[PDB]
Design a protein around this ligand. Structure first.
Ligand SMILES: NC(=O)c1ccc[n+]([C@@H]2O[C@H](COP(=O)([O-])OP(=O)(O)OC[C@H]3O[C@@H](n4cnc5c(N)ncnc54)[C@H](OP(=O)(O)O)[C@@H]3O)[C@@H](O)[C@H]2O)c1
Ligand SMILES: NC(=O)c1ccc[n+]([C@@H]2O[C@H](COP(=O)([O-])OP(=O)(O)OC[C@H]3O[C@@H](n4cnc5c(N)ncnc54)[C@H](OP(=O)(O)O)[C@@H]3O)[C@@H](O)[C@H]2O)c1
Ligand SMILES: NC(=O)c1ccc[n+]([C@@H]2O[C@H](COP(=O)([O-])OP(=O)(O)OC[C@H]3O[C@@H](n4cnc5c(N)ncnc54)[C@H](OP(=O)(O)O)[C@@H]3O)[C@@H](O)[C@H]2O)c1
Ligand SMILES: [Cl-]
Ligand SMILES: [Cl-]
Ligand SMILES: [Cl-]
Ligand SMILES: [Mg+2]
Ligand SMILES: [Mg+2]
Lengths: 250, 251, 252, 250
């Protein structure tokens, strides 16, 4: 259907937002590789969506540079030329800038920023100039648009992804690469991980935070990623797609 | 399966160009559509080019005509049932710097591009709130609502106004649990017979210093993002700006 | 009196109260000659005298939505002080209505001042200040409400988003044509002024930490000082930009 | 007199933009410590501005975390408690995202991002709750607002600075630290950084790039920094100050 012929890598694809992206990608006809760090979880997640003819799990840590080349080779071996890269893997640190230790800072940025860099750079190299309608979708958060006093390192990583993606988009467009790069900026989304933090959903559902008075669900982010992966969005590049319940509109 | 099943849409300025493509893809996705425009022969031919009166109808209406807006909703509702979707797309251009803009040009453009969008948004909230329709208002606000252009002063004013007024509406609807979303769409240069009739226009906007992709878009590029915004797929998106511009604003 | 605006001649619309008064006050303190406008001659004459004598500041009764009066206002100012170098389009009004609840009368009245007035002053300011080596500067008063929405200020939001982007168009045309005129926008957050004071509950609502992270609203001098920077030749490379002084309001 | 009583650290204050900031800060009454890696350049720069009663040089690489603590100690010993931190040190790499080596990425980010994090975190720690009218000014760029196809790592670093600074501003404000944090976004400015990239001034002077048709001068950035360091800006925090010749207005 809407993603006919697409082959997608979805990092952090075994839980929450990434899992829903993979689910709707398969529903729309794409073949998907979802990555994660734990194999006992990752395989049941893939099977929860489809069989190995449409979706497969590959253990990969987004900060693992060499593993990225291996991840692409495995995906192409399974499904053919990669067309779509969703850089979704990330981690959080609940600290102000003042209270962030240098170890927390470096570890978060090696996943949230270096990992997105590794996936974007390689995706451009492996997908340019092949008539694929290639699309790189970088998950860049409402925390890439506004600050949060207790997400200092996360804010830095998401702001970096936001503008680095415009650089990539412009270079691909100017060089007729047939690769588009866009960022998605989710507001608060209900996941089992948000569930395990007592008070988190309640805090984020305050009207002063999310004007809709509730947080979203993973499918809310999947559907905008479907649009961005499909050729329906062949004129969209370097842009920010915000699905946040009004959070940044006030 | 149809992504706009059961939706009922008004698309102003929907007989040519971007509005016509939005109407076409809306019908294709299962919506019933009323398109508006000022000229009846163009408008009737436009509607029939998309489908029969069971899925699409033309209503003659100038978007700056405040009184006509209530009749337009009534006509749409009697044909298709309650309106769920309003695309405020009607708009005109003035090729003048702020310095060179006449007061008559200023007022005429703003009466369509700003007053009209206000009339449709205000009435849309009134008529669609609290009805469980998954209502969506889509305001066309242009890259000229994000960046300035030295020779588009009044257009820039109108589109910046639509951009932020739409956030006001989105927030009020959300805080009041109205079940109405309001978002803006920001097209870059798009090929239309309007652009084709202006010699060198497509060539100027295709320069890499304007559009990095080196070409201008097509009306269906805007239609597809409007389908996303009209559908229940985007039920968590409100008050946000959706930019389809070939990279224009990213540099 | 010091000298960061030496030789400048400024029109400050709505300069008899609140933010406009503070702009005029600090402009005079920095060496500028100033004409303030307003609709009430009694408040306005006293406002000007409260800042200085007629050799540094004068009041002119003018509604900013009155197009023909704009030409007379420039003539009167240049007759008094020489060619105008600086236009601060500050006059503005508010309406506490959602988009849904805004009447068309309220919509047109607010926009005739907040948008048409800024257009009239920007258009005429370009015509009368271009190509004169003045280091000219047009400062258009937007608001944080030109950057984010407010559910109960629909028309005001529209007017301030219009000012924000129209000003960019004017700045670009002036720059590309070497007019020696800059155009920038100032976006105050909540500021203690009569506009705020006489909206019951407004300061209290805006002082909440969920609104202004600094936990209080600003004061008129906060906006005067960024305007002094923008009117001075210190900002000669600044054009088409948005200057936000808002207590952190738009950072979260 | 506009900076009477202020004590400022200006990283990379020995050439270009940072030198002009230091110069104007001293003119307005501040005591200033400038940093840089090269003591030959730095000692002369300090002497070109004033005597050791108003300005001193400290050899320090902004990417050196341990050195930041020494730098604040040295400044305190000379001039009293620091009131103003200008995180200005930065470098550039003329590579698209596709063409960026991981070494180039890590080197630029360790200076442009880690260094701004180190100085912001330390500035907050050292200046909070002292009633100093403290101000942290983080040097971003128009390249933290828009992309550039050939400055991918730089774009990443400047977008990170932009949004991390908002987080810091918010935390300082909500906690009543009496510390403001803002970012400055220069457009092209004539500096050794620009003068060494051959053809860069000519490129950035095109009207399609800078509408004013010329690039700026270091004093253009000095004056907005004076405003931000002074108590004139006591209501300005978390905001972006753009001095760019119209670059980002089109
Ligand atoms: N400047 C740019 O950068 C640029 C370039 C290309 C496209 N765009 C985008 O294109 C979008 C839509 O414009 P378009 O190019 O599709 O225009 P278009 O091709 O001229 O189509 C105009 C449609 O609106 C109708 N219309 C005109 N005035 C009207 C009124 N007062 N009331 C109701 N309908 C009216 C037209 O004819 P009738 O009145 O006879 O029906 C026609 O159906 C804008 O948001 C703009 O951002 C922008
Ligand atoms: N206060 C805030 O929190 C705040 C925040 C962001 C932006 N702003 C903006 O800053 C500007 C000044 O606001 P403020 O709070 O200082 O307002 P204010 O305290 O109400 O003062 C408004 C001034 O404008 C004059 N004025 C009003 N309507 C006018 C018209 N049609 N023509 C000429 N002068 C007129 C008033 O004098 P007369 O009544 O005698 O005419 C008065 O001198 C406005 O553009 C406002 O939107 C204010
Ligand atoms: N020039 C522009 O057009 C422009 C535009 C926007 C933003 N900016 C930003 O403004 C800032 C200053 O740029 P500029 O053009 O003035 O550069 P510049 O002329 O090359 O000056 C660089 C200064 O920083 C110092 N420096 C370099 N690496 C350092 C390190 N690791 N630790 C400490 N100091 C270091 C240099 O001294 P040593 O070599 O002795 O260390 C020198 O004092 C940078 O953040 C830049 O990204 C510049
Ligand atoms: Cl994210
Ligand atoms: Cl009057
Ligand atoms: Cl200290
Ligand atoms: Mg906000
Ligand atoms: Mg641009």
């Amino acid at each position: 259907d809407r993603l006919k012929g697409k082959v997608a890598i979805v990092t952090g694809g075994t839980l929450g937002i990434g899992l829903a992206i993979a689910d709707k990608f398969v529903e729309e006809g794409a073949k998907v590789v979802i990555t994660g760090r734990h194999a006992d979880v990752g395989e049941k997640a893939a099977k929860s969506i489809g069989g190995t003819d449409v979706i497969r799990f590959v253990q990969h840590d987004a900060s693992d540079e060499a593993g990225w080349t291996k991840l692409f080779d495995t995906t192409e071996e399974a499904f053919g030329p990669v067309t779509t890269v969703v850089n979704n893997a990330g981690i959080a640190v609940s600290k102000s800038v003042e209270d962030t230790t240098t170890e927390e800072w470096r570890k978060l940025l090696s996943v949230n920023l270096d990992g997105v860099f590794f996936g974007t750079r390689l995706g451009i190299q492996r997908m340019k100039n092949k008539g694929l309608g290639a699309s790189i979708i970088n998950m860049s958060s409402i925390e890439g648009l506004v600050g949060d006093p207790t997400q200092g390192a996360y804010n830095a990583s998401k702001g970096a992804v936001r503008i680095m993606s415009k650089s990539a988009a412009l270079d691909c467009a100017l060089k007729d690469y047939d690769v588009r790069v866009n960022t998605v900026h989710p507001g608060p989304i209900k996941t089992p991980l948000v569930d395990d933090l007592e008070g988190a959903e309640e805090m984020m559902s305050q009207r002063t935070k999310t004007p809709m008075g509730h947080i979203g669900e993973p499918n809310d982010i999947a559907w905008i990623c479907v649009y961005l992966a499909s050729d329906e969005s062949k004129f969209a590049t370097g842009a920010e797609f915000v699905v946040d319940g009004g959070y940044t509109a006030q």
